[PDB]
Structures are given as structure tokens and as C-alpha cells.
Design a protein around this ligand. Structure first.
Ligand SMILES: C=C(NCc1c(COP(=O)(O)O)cnc(C)c1O)C(=O)O
Ligand SMILES: C=C(NCc1c(COP(=O)(O)O)cnc(C)c1O)C(=O)O
Ligand SMILES: N#C[C@@H]1N[C@@H](CO)[C@H]1c1ccc(-c2ccccc2F)cc1
Ligand SMILES: N#C[C@@H]1N[C@@H](CO)[C@H]1c1ccc(-c2ccccc2F)cc1
Ligand SMILES: [Cs+]
Ligand SMILES: [Cs+]
Ligand SMILES: [Cs+]
Ligand SMILES: [Cs+]
Ligand SMILES: [Cs+]
Lengths: 399, 249, 399, 248
């Protein structure tokens, strides 16, 4: 409870980061979800139900693997990969989805809706809804359906309706807008399973609470395998769920550096990027006061990245607060840097990461050079790269 | 003191009618044509104009309004163009309020936008994604610059939130949404005497007249945009039929 | 042990299952591998290395999951899924590969070759060779390269060379023939990482010893979760590695029924199947005396299945021995039955299986109706369906 | 008392030359043409004929033989066509052994195949995928029906396994593969006086002559199939060229 926001959802003061920048038409169901979550987060029978699925269905705990063959590209630092790539569905997204789907059943909701960019949240939601007998509708940007087509097909086999969004940039922010419109119209029977650590309260806190397990496990594992707490813990940052998940357990370890890596695309100087903390500024977007990419008038600037999961011009408010506090540093990583790391990890350790995760790997290599020989860096390997194989094969001239 | 829009509703209620509240977005189909269109609304009997600020991600706008705001933004429309539209409306003898999503107001500066809106003759602000829970700065700027504050209520609104939203509003409460609309207005009237404007996708004289039985104002948006797309003469004819609808005797 | 073959590789004494039906040109390297396996299986360094990789790299143990939403489709029996689909690379193949790849490096071999049908053994082999820095060449039939194309691109990303085999049926048996010819020529420097429980001694025993971990985990897990040993344990059977892996720990529990399900393609009456026990007979093929599909003169008959992994006219010699003894029963499952079960597992449990594993689930559903309410059936869920999503989406009209 | 092929190698060793051992596969290009080709080999001066049994998965056969056996199988060739080929060779005055992968023999019946091979006038069996370790049934069948058993040795063969393979062979040893062929033949001569045949992808007269300097037999196959594909006269011409080669 120490790092939590107030009852209005604000971090850092009653008018600080987070809150609820939503229409009055959503407030009944937002308050309903908030009350349900406050009740269930302190129920042992709920936490038991979530734990039992995490262990037997999702296969937790995920392991921590020392990637020794990266060391020479990381200044002889020691890169430890937290293997969320080995979860059911292939990403950290399932952690949050199991919690929220269990909550939707507890609330008596029969219909679940979700947004997705990379398709990993969409697949995770479809999976949980099939498992729990819930009707499922996934909203996905049209550009993302084309570049993450393996995940579209998976969602459809799992029994979900997939709706391609043609508005705006046809990517994650626009999928979110459509899902929001659905929820406004269907609040009575519909639960909105939001897939990142952003949005109006209670979502940043709830999503973070269900992803906390990553960091809790990693903190035990690294002390066991390296003999001490790490010099750093790093992750990529889309809306911020996998990062906040692994970071949270180390927040009160003052010797542990925390670094979030954001998608810089073609470069931060080009205007084709998603580097929200590097190039953005504070504002109200998708339910929260946080950082976003915006112009002089406050219009959202469309993001770009080779990674569909990091192609988002906003970021969660807890990250904004942690940035302002001086606790986490956030830094750009380009498409090229990420693909060099994607390729290195395949070649050296035999792990095909998500392109999202390859940004974190790329960042860890640079951090390794900065910190030097024997520094212990834990990296959240947020997901696997099967959805990205076609894109990566093309990038490396392999068909 | 009395709300800025108080005299309009008092005047309408004395002539046994509702106020006609007309929405157009600044910059559609371009900036000059939109100003000509808003002037036409004043000339054709709109009691109040909602000057829409086009936003990149307008979650509460329907398809007709969303396509039009996209077109405005492709045209290069700015927030200061909405202030110019309000000036033009004030010069023409009209009464303008601005409807905007909150982030353009934050980026401009809440106090500064309230100052400049009041300077242009603007009477208030309609805030579809700002709830009273987050409205501390806006309430301060609203009192300082004598601007009305029109929050929305919905059929799903709980008793607690409806009472708090009406209490926080000045000028009118926007009852956004079939018997849902009279029931929602009925709930607002049970706690307060503030005027209630009703939006229901109105497109004809008959619908405007139905709403004027129970509501203090009839809000029309989508159908004005559709009318303007066809042409300025079509907008004048439609506004004239809606102005006839709001009157009862 | 009670279940091991003699020093020549024969199971069951004078039935003569197994052995070595290979040219003298291969016997020097076959004897080399046999000796190196016998030495390394009792070396604590080797077992520590294998164990470290199974835990931290591959993600063992795999969980055991009670699929309660399947129960009504299986005569109210209790289906437990042994989740080999959650292993690194997405199948059981990785278990055998880490063992054999560590062994290749211990022997001083500088090149690894493998055959693949579904592409999972290929991907696992490529994975281990990336990890250990060995040159890798995977042989894959040309029909398999087309229908399992995701795995071809993964192999190439992992640094493995892939050779499309265009001879015979252009499927797994033909890939095995080509890899055999490579080994004959390059024996002095090359290790053959054979991916199933067939071949000459020592491969059937060695592959089974590396896959035994599945059944040892399953036996402990089912007693923990259900409070007793199962009524049955079931698996699909290609060459036989996942089946023998899960079965082995239950061999000496007399009340545990063991059922292997083989691919029947268009149906056993059609001549377009891979139903080796149902329609085949004893013979020498691919290095062993076991069962195979063969005509009146002993020419190998080409197999057919929608599943690339089960599309093999042979079967491993330990299975022939267990069939002879009456310890295991082997039953046919058609393409249609397998795909029905594929779809059902997707909609009920949110798990997209391999089409290989779908045959085992289909058989389990039928066995549940025979055994009745409350019967406990452990099903080896050998792989995930990433590679089969296009085939299945085409099958169900989802395009 | 002695092997079936022993008098052929002694007759060669008395005329100061190596034996020419000719392989053709049964049923290529069809069954009647293949038998007419095998008769042509007897006339053109082949001392021993290897009658190939086409197999569906011929692991050790090179591309020329593999494609010919594939074609024979498409054409419907049967194991009994081989025994008919052995009989036609034996009536023509030639000496025939059968080369086959082991599964066709298992399927037929090891004893029954030996019996019927012997009744056709066959002298022995070449077994490329049968090592002595698995040859218990064959050893017994071989002894009873008086058939030579030609096993293969390789450059890679360990000393122990080379000794065991040579000891298990009657008739000759098929030494299959720079200086590897003479070195392998040398290692067999160091532990046994059994004849050694050498198969080295022989194409020409000069190549057969080089091999005849150290080997008791020169084995040709690939080149004979290539010759038959162009024509039956081209096979006669080549076989006559190779006949002259082994006398040098
Ligand atoms: C947006 C989506 N995915 C984001 C994602 C991310 C970034 O999202 P976070 O919410 O920052 O964790 C990282 N890694 C993987 C494997 C991902 O799939 C999605 O699949 O809907
Ligand atoms: C032949 C290959 N796979 C077979 C396979 C099988 C059948 O092979 P077994 O050796 O019978 O387990 C079962 N399940 C999965 C997921 C498989 O991939 C291959 O990947 O090369
Ligand atoms: N009206 C209004 C707002 N214009 C848009 C953004 O400013 C729209 C909006 C979109 C999405 C969300 C949202 C995101 C995550 C979880 C739950 C949510 F509701 C909220 C608001
Ligand atoms: N000559 C000969 C045999 N004709 C072929 C058919 O059986 C060929 C063969 C092919 C493969 C194998 C094999 C399979 C698995 C592991 C190791 C192996 F060597 C053995 C023999
Ligand atoms: Cs971002
Ligand atoms: Cs490229
Ligand atoms: Cs695990
Ligand atoms: Cs490699
Ligand atoms: Cs089989």
C-alpha cells in the first residue's frame, strides 16, 4: 500500500498524476470495477484462485536465465533474463488478464472487451474468456492486424470476434478509442479488460498489482543466482505494465537502478517515434494525467515504431510519477538498435524475443557498457517473438 | 450571482419555449466557412451556439461529428480559431459556449483559456471528459472569469454523482443519452432548479418539440453538421424548423 | 533397469525389437555415441549441466492442469493436461535436444545434424546449437517446409541451416534418410541429434532417458493434485518420444492403463494414414526392428496425416515391445477427430494445441466415455499450435 | 569345405588378374530389358553379377542407382523378379549373387529366401545394412543352403569390427568407399586370405586396372547403369573395356 495512489487515483498529491479523465457516462461502471477490485484484492479465496491458475494453467514461476553469451556485448556485465516469454500465450499479458477475468466473473459480467496492438493482450484475453466461458470482443488497429496476423488468427480460433479499427493511425491508441466507445455503450453487461498500466483509476493500480508477481519472483531469484541484489533492473515501456511489474519489488532497494526503455522508431529527431518521456509532455489522455506525445494545441501526435506493442504515444501515470521522483530513468531505443539486439539474442542464446522485449535487451547492452565488468542487470524478457518472425526474417534477409 | 446563461432560459421560459442549442465544430469544412455557418445559426434563431474544438481522439463524438473534426484538423484548424469563432458569434448578436475535451484546455493553460474565452464574449464551457472530481482548477477559473460550467449527466449516473454534478454545474446541465431522457431530466429536477439541455440525436422539428415538453433546452449537433455538408442554405432551413419545434404556444 | 535393452539394443530377448540395422560405415560413430552416453549419464558434471538448463532455460517443470471444461465432453471423466506446450520452443523436443547437444560437445563433435517434420525438433536443435556454439544443419521434407513454414523461419533466425528434402514422400521419413546419408559421410566431425525414440541403439534408449522427466513429473504431480495414480495415461505417437517419456514412470504401476494414439489420416481403410500398429507389421527400417507400414515385399509404404509430426510410417522399438507384452494399447485417431478436439481445446480451455497433441486429446475424450465419471486421465500435451494456426484457421473457415 | 565363389577367384588368380563384378538393378528400365542386360554382362565378360533388389529407402545407394531402383519400383518390380533374374543368369553360364537391403529378406522369410535363392542357382548375398551383430538367422540360413555371405567393411571400421566382419564373411568382403581403398584392402589382408572386392565409383578401363593391382575383385555398378540408360550396346562396349582393365 505504500506506493499506491489516493482514492481518486492520483499519484503525488490530490491533483497529481493519474486520476479519471473520463465521461460521466463511464463513472458508474468505473466505480463498480473499483469497488469490486478493492473487495477482491484482500480476499484470500480470490488470491488463491489467481495463484492456482498462475501455477497450473500459466506455468509460473518463470525462470531467471543468465545470458552469459551476451556479456561481451554488454561491457562484460552479466545480463539475467526474466523469462516471461515462457508464459502461456507467450507474454506477461496473461498475468493481468487472469486477474481481471477472474474479477469479471466475480462481478457477474458476461461480455469482455479488450484493445490490442501486438495481439498478445488480445490473445491473452481471448484465452481467459474461453477458459471462463465469457463472450469476447477484441479491438485491434488495421495496421496491427496486418503486421501481427498470427495473433489475429489465434484470437479467432479461441472464439473471439476481432474488430479491425480504421480510425486515426490504425494502431494501439485507436484500438483503445474504439474499445472505450464500446464500453460506454455496453457498460451494463460488459467488462473492459484493459491491457496496460494506464487508463483511469483503478486500471493503473490493478494492472500493476497483477504484474507485481514478475518483480517479486525476480527479486528472490537474482539473490539466489547472483548472491545479491542487482545493480539494475530494466524493461521496455509501452503503456508500462511489464516494467512496473518487475520494478515494483525493487522500489525500496536504494542501490538498484531502474531503467525503462521506450520505442524511438526512426529516431527522436525524425518525428517517427513513440518516445513519450524523451519528447512528450504532461497532459490528459486515455483516462489519466501523464506524459504524452502532443503538439502545441494539445492534439495527440501519432506514434510510430517497428514494434506494435510499443507504438503508443502515451504512458502510465505511475511511470510519470516515478520519473518525476527521480526513481526510474527512461531512455530511447531505436528500431535498428532493437533489431540488432533481437538478432543477437537469437544467435547467441537461442531465444527469439518479442520485438518489444528486444528494446529492453538493447538497452541492457548499453547499460552494461556504462556500468562495466561484473555488474548484474536483470532484464524483463516480456514475450516471445513468434508473432514477429515474418517481420524479423524480412529484416535479416531470410525470406 | 446569476449564471451567464440565466437570462436566455428565463426569456425562453417566459415565451413558453425551450432554448435551441446548436453545435458546430470550428474549421469544418474550413475555418472561414465554419464561421459563416455559425453566423447563419445566430441569424436563423439559435439561442445558444456550442463552438466545438476539434480534438485528435474524440471518444464521445458520433461518426458524423468525428469525420467532420478529422476534416477540420486536416485543414489545419487551431484552438485560437475557436476563440475567433466565439468573437464572430458575439459580434453577430449571438451567445457562444465552447465544447472541448480537456487536454487542449490544459495545454493552453486553464486560467488563460478561461480569461481569453471570457474576453471574446464566451459565456461558458461544456466539458464531456472532465468530471467535477478533477475540476478544481476549472472551478477556480470559472468563478474568476464569470464563465458557466456545463457538466454532463447520463442515465447510468448514480444518485450521489448526479447530485454532485448538478451542484457543480452553472448555466445548464447537459443530459446526454425511448423514456431514458425524460426520466433523467426528471431526476435532475428533483434535486435542483438548474436548466437541463437534452441531446438525443435530434434531426427534425417533431423530435425537438417532443423534448421541449420536459426540457429547458434542446441540443442539436449531428444533424447541423450533416446539413452544412450539403450546404449553407440547407442549414438555414433545418435550423428554422428546429426553432419552430422548440416553441409550444 | 528392468526395462532397458541388452548391450546390442534388443528389447524383450528373442522377439529382437530394436538393435542396429545400419551399415558398417556407421558403426564406429554409433559405438562412439553409445560409449559417450554410458560415460556421461553417470557424470555429475553432465547431469548438473542438464539440470541447470532444464530449470533456468527450458522452464521445467511443466505444469499439470485439470481441464475441467473438457469433462462434460469426456463422459464426466477428469482430463489432466501435462503441459509440455509451455516448454522453451513449445514442445517436448527440447528435453531430448539439451541432453544430446550437451553430449555432442562432450564428444568434441563440431557439427550437429537433425531431421524435422513438424519443425519443432529442428527449432529445438537450432536453439541448443545457438546456445552451445555448434554448426547446425536441419533436414526437412519439402511438403513439411511449406505447411510448417513458421518453424523454417525460426530455425533460420536461430542460425541453423535448413535443407529442403525433395525425395520420396518429402516428409519426415525422407528427411531422416538424407540426414543419415550426411552422417555416413561426415561421421568423424558430426553428431546426429535424432529427435524421436526410434533408430539404432543407442537412440531409442537415450531419447527415452532424456524424455523420462515428463512422466516422473507427471506421476508426482497427479498424486499431489488428485491424491492417487491415474486410471489412464495417454499420448500421441509419431516415432514415440513424448509417449514413451510420459509412460515410462507408470510402467510398474499395474492399474494405470497406457494408451498411445496414432494418426489415421483420412481413415485406416483409405491407404492415407500413419496408423503403424493398426495396419503395419514387423520389419527393419531406419535402424531398428519394430513395426512399420510396408507392402507384401517389404517396401515402406508412404504415410499421410494432416499432422506433420505423426506423418511417419515407422514407430520406435520400445513401443513394439510394450505392445507385444500387452502393457500399452495403441489406437487410431483420424484427421477429423483430431481437428474436432483441436477446436474444442481452443474454446473450452483457451489452449491452442499442436495438431499432433490434438490426436491425444481426441483419444482422451473417447477414453473418458469408456471409463466414465470421475476417472482420472493424464494426457501429454506435447506441443502448442503456433505452427498450425494457418492450417486450423483454414480447416474451420476463419479467413 | 570352401566358399561358392572361391573357384572364380582362384581361376582369376591363376590367370593373373582380378575378377570383374557387375551390378545391375532388377526391373530397370523394365524386367525383360534388365534380364537381357544381365545376360549381356555374362557375354561381355563379367565374372560375377550382383543382382540388385530395388528397395524403397536405399540408404547406401548413390544417385544413379537410387533413381534407377525408384524407376524399377514405379514399373512394378517385385522381389520374385530378382530370383527369375538369377535363374536366367545361371542358365546363360554366369555366376550371380544378390545385393539387397535386409527388410525385403525378413518379409520374404530369411530361410525361404535362402532356399529359393539357392534353387535359382544363386551363390550368395551382399548385405549393406546387415552387420554380423544382427546376422544370426542369416548365418544359419547361409550354412544350410550353401550361400556365400558378403559383408561390407569401411575405412572407418575399427580394428576389432574389421576382424569380426572378415571372420563372418564367406566368398569375399566388399570393401566400400585418396589412399583409402588400398589401405582398407591392406588391413583385411593382414588378418585373412579371403578375397576382397573394391567398389570406388569405377567409370573407366584405367580405374579398373589401378584397383586390380591390389584387389582380388573390381566392383562396378553406377557406371553400368549409366551405360544401360544410353543403350544396351553402350553397356556391352563398356563392360568389354572393364574386362580388359582387370587383366592389366
Ligand atoms: C500492446 C500490446 N502488447 C505490448 C507488449 C509490451 C509493452 O507493453 P507494456 O504494457 O508496456 O508491458 C511488451 N512486451 C510484449 C511481449 C508486448 O506484447 C498488446 O499485445 O496488446
Ligand atoms: C517430428 C517432429 N515432431 C513430432 C511431434 C510429436 C510426435 O513425435 P514423438 O517422437 O512421437 O513424440 C508430438 N508432438 C509434437 C508437438 C511434435 O512436434 C519434429 O518436430 O521434427
Ligand atoms: N471522453 C473521452 C476521452 N477522449 C479519449 C482520450 O482522451 C477518450 C477515452 C479513451 C479511453 C479511455 C480508457 C482507457 C483505458 C481504460 C478505460 C478507459 F475508459 C478513457 C477515455
Ligand atoms: N543403410 C541403410 C538404411 N536404408 C535406410 C532406411 O532404413 C537407411 C537408414 C536411415 C536412417 C537410419 C537412422 C535413423 C535414426 C538415427 C540414426 C540412424 F542411422 C538408419 C538407416
Ligand atoms: Cs510510450
Ligand atoms: Cs533487409
Ligand atoms: Cs515453470
Ligand atoms: Cs549455430
Ligand atoms: Cs506412426
Amino acid at each position: 500500500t505504500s506506493h499506491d495512489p489516493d482514492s481518486g487515483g492520483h499519484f503525488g498529491g490530490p491533483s497529481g498524476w493519474g486520476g479519471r479523465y473520463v465521461p460521466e457516462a463511464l463513472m458508474a461502471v468505473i466505480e463498480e470495477v473499483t469497488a469490486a477490485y478493492q473487495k477482491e484484492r484482500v480476499s484470500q479465496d480470490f488470491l488463491d484462485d489467481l495463484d492456482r491458475l498462475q501455477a497450473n494453467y500459466a506455468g509460473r514461476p518463470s525462470p531467471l536465465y543468465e545470458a552469459t553469451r551476451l556479456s561481451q556485448h554488454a561491457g562484460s556485465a552479466r545480463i539475467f533474463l526474466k523469462r516471461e516469454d515462457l508464459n502461456h500465450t507467450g507474454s506477461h499479458k496473461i498475468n493481468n488478464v487472469l486477474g481481471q477475468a477472474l474479477l469479471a466473473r466475480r462481478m457477474g459480467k458476461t461480455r469482455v472487451i479488450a484493445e490490442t496492438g501486438a495481439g498478445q493482450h488480445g490473445v491473452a484475453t481471448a484465452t481467459a474468456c474461453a477458459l471462463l466461458g465469457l463472450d469476447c470482443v477484441i479491438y485491434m488497429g488495421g495496421i496491427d492486424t496486418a503486421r501481427q496476423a498470427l495473433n489475429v488468427a489465434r484470437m479467432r480460433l479461441l472464439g473471439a470476434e476481432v474488430v479491425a479499427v480504421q480510425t486515426g493511425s490504425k494502431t494501439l491508441k485507436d484500438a483503445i478509442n474504439e474499445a472505450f466507445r464500446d464500453w460506454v455503450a455496453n457498460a451494463d453487461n460488459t467488462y473492459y479488460c484493459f491491457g496496460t498500466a494506464a487508463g483511469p483509476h483503478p486500471f493503473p493500480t490493478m494492472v500493476r498489482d497483477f504484474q507485481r508477481i514478475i518483480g517479486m519472483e525476480a527479486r528472490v531469484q537474482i539473490q539466489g543466482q547472483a548472491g545479491r541484489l542487482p545493480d539494475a533492473v530494466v524493461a521496455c515501456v509501452g503503456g508500462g505494465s511489464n516494467a512496473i511489474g518487475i520494478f515494483h519489488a525493487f522500489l525500496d532497494d536504494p542501490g538498484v537502478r531502474l531503467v525503462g526503455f521506450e520505442a524511438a522508431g526512426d529516431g527522436v529527431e525524425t518525428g517517427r517515434h513513440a518516445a513519450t518521456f524523451t519528447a512528450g509532455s504532461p497532459g490528459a489522455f486515455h483516462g489519466s494525467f501523464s506524459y504524452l506525445l502532443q503538439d502545441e494545441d494539445g492534439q495527440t501526435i501519432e506514434s510510430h515504431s517497428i514494434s506494435a506493442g510499443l507504438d503508443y504515444p502515451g504512458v502510465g501515470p505511475e511511470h510519470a510519477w516515478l520519473k518525476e521522483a527521480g526513481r526510474v530513468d527512461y531512455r530511447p531505443i531505436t528500431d535498428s538498435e532493437a533489431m540488432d539486439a533481437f538478432g543477437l539474442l537469437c544467435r547467441m542464446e537461442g531465444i527469439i524475443p518479442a520485438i518489444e522485449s528486444a528494446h529492453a535487451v538493447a538497452g541492457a547492452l548499453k547499460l552494461g557498457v556504462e556500468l562495466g565488468r561484473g555488474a548484474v542487470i536483470v532484464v524483463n524478457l516480456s514475450g516471445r517473438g513468434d508473432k514477429d518472425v515474418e517481420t524479423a526474417a524480412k529484416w535479416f534477409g531470410l525470406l | 450571482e446569476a449564471s451567464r446563461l440565466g437570462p436566455v432560459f428565463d426569456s425562453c421560459r417566459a415565451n413558453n419555449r425551450a432554448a435551441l442549442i446548436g453545435y458546430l465544430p470550428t474549421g469544418y469544412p474550413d475555418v472561414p466557412a465554419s464561421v459563416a455557418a455559425m453566423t447563419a445559426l445566430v441569424e436563423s434563431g439559435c439561442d445558444i451556439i456550442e463552438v466545438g474544438v476539434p480534438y485528435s481522439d474524440p471518444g464521445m463524438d458520433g461518426p458524423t461529428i468525428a469525420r467532420a473534426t478529422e476534416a477540420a484538423l486536416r485543414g489545419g484548424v487551431r484552438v485560437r480559431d475557436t476563440l475567433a469563432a466565439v468573437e464572430a458569434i458575439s459580434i453577430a448578436g449571438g451567445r457562444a459556449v465552447v465544447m472541448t475535451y480537456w487536454n487542449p484546455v490544459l495545454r493552453y493553460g486553464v486560467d488563460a483559456f478561461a480569461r481569453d474565452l471570457a474576453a471574446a464574449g464566451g459565456l461558458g464551457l461544456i466539458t464531456p471528459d472532465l468530471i467535477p472530481d478533477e475540476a478544481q482548477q476549472w472551478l477556480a477559473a470559472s468563478e474568476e472569469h464569470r464563465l458557466d460550467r456545463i457538466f454532463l449527466v447520463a442515465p447510468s449516473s448514480t444518485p450521489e454523482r448526479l447530485a454532485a454534478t448538478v451542484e457543480a454545474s452553472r448555466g445548464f446541465v447537459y443530459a446526454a443519452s425511448s423514456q431514458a431522457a425524460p426520466e433523467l431530466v426528471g431526476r435532475v429536477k428533483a434535486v435542483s432548479d438548474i436548466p437541463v439541455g437534452v441531446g438525443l440525436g435530434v434531426r427534425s422539428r417533431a423530435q425537438a418539440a417532443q423534448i421541449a415538453q420536459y426540457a429547458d433546452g434542446v441540443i442539436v449537433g449531428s444533424a447541423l453538421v450533416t446539413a452544412l455538408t450539403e450546404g449553407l442554405p440547407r442549414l438555414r432551413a433545418l435550423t428554422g424548423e428546429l426553432a419552430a419545434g422548440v416553441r409550444l404556444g
